[PDB]
């Protein structure tokens, strides 16, 4: 029975948060400067709280709402809020799957769309924006999203992304209707295919030119940017979002397990496997990213050498990258009148700056892996395999999330006595798909950015803080430990008690305080926006109406707890 539960938890946890979100989160916050907090936040926040969730699922042996209502009525709201967060997640998570579907369907063409830039219009060169950026970046930002230059500028609903999202939701609904317990052979298959595909891309990814640059960027803990509180916040929230903490479905999964089971081994194994998968996927992604950065640096050096050679009438191969500065000094000393004209034009490029600003954003995984695919032999087969692995991961994660959404609805006899479950699931999927059309607009990527960073980011911290305070102080940690010891014969270790009671809540509170102080001091929340004319990413301040949605997304889910307490107090009085 252990294999079933462990693989169910692994299949829930291992999803797009490991393969897609972790790489771009690591790239955004300095690489190593993000990886050091991650591990630090995994020993303190991941393992103890995952074990606490799994133990609460067993000693109650009820659902999330049932457990947090049986501990105390004044707390029942944290069962409702844990559903709402899932809702918001399911509102935007599917968009990622949609994108993969798109990238799959544009994978049966000999001239792969992200391989060759379109012709400029003279039929003699390439597009300006497709040349300033990469072909992969041009495909992702223009052919895929058609991203608007600013959040204030939005067009209509792009029909192709809308159809892809509709298809993804239809696939999710079909998976909901079809199977619920036939995951027997799937768990043997769906757990090894992502590792096999990542192994193949690692075999390709570690033999590219300049692959070591990406790994060095990944594993170097720059102290200068290690002091950023946002890095710690993002690390903790990614840990919570990847382990599934706060969504309330881990409690339901552990509710079906025997009370004579070792939840200390299972929690450790699940957290470690999740961490290892994230690290491995990010290693492959950053090896390809380092290849991209090295290629960009070499291209800039070649362009500068060509510029000098075409002007100074130097030999064809005389000016190389190993003698660039010396020959520049020699040319400047020869005659300054000619050198003065183009001195603005000569561009400085270094590996470090390219590494920070080669590729960044929520499309890092897609851009990087499409670049890697375009450097394969049979690009079509590898593209299909990778974007099929990604599809399986996303579909599994969404099945878990939607099960967490739907179980409270099905368990409610008020709704179950009026409509069939097949209609309840259909209505939920229809509402989610209709609302998620806001992510398919021209400026839909910015709303996806807002939801990926605020819908299920800090609410997952506050939900878990309330849960752990509830377990330790309201219920009584001595009573909980005695119940667990009677259930499994072994008393909880002193380390787990220490991490449950004081360390994890204090670290969460400190993180919240630091984030709030940083936001107040900065006083200007900014987002990345594509610039096709400059062909890169620029920082722009959020408009007035974008802060209201950002506030409401967190506020509804978090404030759902105190409101229930006030309602219960009113009902009592």
């Amino acid at each position: 029975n252990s294999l079933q539960f462990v693989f169910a938890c692994i299949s829930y946890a291992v999803g797009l948060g490991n393969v897609w979100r972790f790489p771009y989160l690591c790239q955004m916050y300095g690489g190593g400067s993000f990886l050091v907090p991650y591990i630090i936040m995994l020993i303190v926040e991941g393992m103890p709280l995952l074990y606490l969730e799994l133990a609460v699922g067993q000693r109650m042996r009820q659902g999330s709402i049932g457990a947090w209502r049986t501990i105390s009525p004044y707390l029942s709201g944290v069962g409702v809020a844990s559903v709402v967060v899932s809702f918001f997640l399911s509102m935007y998570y599917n968009v990622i799957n949609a994108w993969a579907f798109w990238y799959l369907f544009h994978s049966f063409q000999d001239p792969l769309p992200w391989s060759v830039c379109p012709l400029n219009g003279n039929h003699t060169g390439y597009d300006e924006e497709c040349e300033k950026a990469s072909s992969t970046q041009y495909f992702w930002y223009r052919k895929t999203l058609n991203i608007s230059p600013s959040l204030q500028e939005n067009g209509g609903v792009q029909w192709e992304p809308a159809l892809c999202l509709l298809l993804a939701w239809l696939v999710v609904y079909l998976c909901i209707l079809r199977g619920t317990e036939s995951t027997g052979k799937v768990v043997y298959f769906t757990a090894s295919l992502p590792y096999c595909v990542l192994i193949i891309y690692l075999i390709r990814g570690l033999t590219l030119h300049g692959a070591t640059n990406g790994l060095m960027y990944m594993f170097t803990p720059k102290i200068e940017q290690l002091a950023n509180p946002k890095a710690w916040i993002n690390a903790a929230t990614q840990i919570f979002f990847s382990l599934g903490l706060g969504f309330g479905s881990l409690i339901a999964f552990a509710s079906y397990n025997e009370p004579s089971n070792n939840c200390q081994k299972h929690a450790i194994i699940v957290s470690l496997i999740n961490s290892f998968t994230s690290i491995f996927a990010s290693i492959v992604t950053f090896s390809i990213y380092g290849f991209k950065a090295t290629f960009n640096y070499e291209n800039c050096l070649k362009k500068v050498s060509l510029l000098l050679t075409n002007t100074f009438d130097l030999e064809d191969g005389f000016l190389t990258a190993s003698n660039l500065e010396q020959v520049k000094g020699y040319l400047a000393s020869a005659y300054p009148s000619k050198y003065s004209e183009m001195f603005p034009q000569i561009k400085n490029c270094s590996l470090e700056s390219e590494l920070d600003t080669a590729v960044q954003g929520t499309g890092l995984a897609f851009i990087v892996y499409t670049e890697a695919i375009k450097n394969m032999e049979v690009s079509q087969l590898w593209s299909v395999l990778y974007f099929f692995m990604l599809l399986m991961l996303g579909i599994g994660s969404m099945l878990g999330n939607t099960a967490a959404i739907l179980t409270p609805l099905t368990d409610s006899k008020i709704i179950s006595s009026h409509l069939p479950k097949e209609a309840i699931s259909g209505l939920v999927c229809l509402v989610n798909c209709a609302i998620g059309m806001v992510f398919t607009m021209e400026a839909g990527n910015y709303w996806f950015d807002i939801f990926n960073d605020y819908a299920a980011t800090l609410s997952l911290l506050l939900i878990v803080l309330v849960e752990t305070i509830a377990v330790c102080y309201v219920y009584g940690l001595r009573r909980f430990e005695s119940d667990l010891k009677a259930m499994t014969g072994r008393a909880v270790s002193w380390y787990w008690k220490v991490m449950w009671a004081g360390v994890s809540p204090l670290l969460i509170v400190s993180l919240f305080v630091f984030y709030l102080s940083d936001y107040i001091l900065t006083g200007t929340l900014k987002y990345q926006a594509w610039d096709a004319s400059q062909g890169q990413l620029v920082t722009k301040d959020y408009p007035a109406y974008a802060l209201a949605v950002i506030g409401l997304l967190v506020a509804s889910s978090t404030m759902c707890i105190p409101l229930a307490a006030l309602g219960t107090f009113v009902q009592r009085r």
């Binding site: 369907f105 063409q109 609904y173 209707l177 069939p420 097949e422």
Partner: peptide, 29 residues
């Protein structure tokens, strides 16, 4: 456009699957 053909095929097969599953579930009950 080849992507459109592949998407049409996939959406058709998925829709037929959903329809048959709903119909079988309703008919069983």
């Amino acid at each position: 456009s080849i992507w459109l053909i592949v998407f049409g095929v996939v959406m058709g097969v998925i829709v037929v699957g959903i329809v048959i599953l709903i119909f079988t579930g309703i008919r069983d009950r």
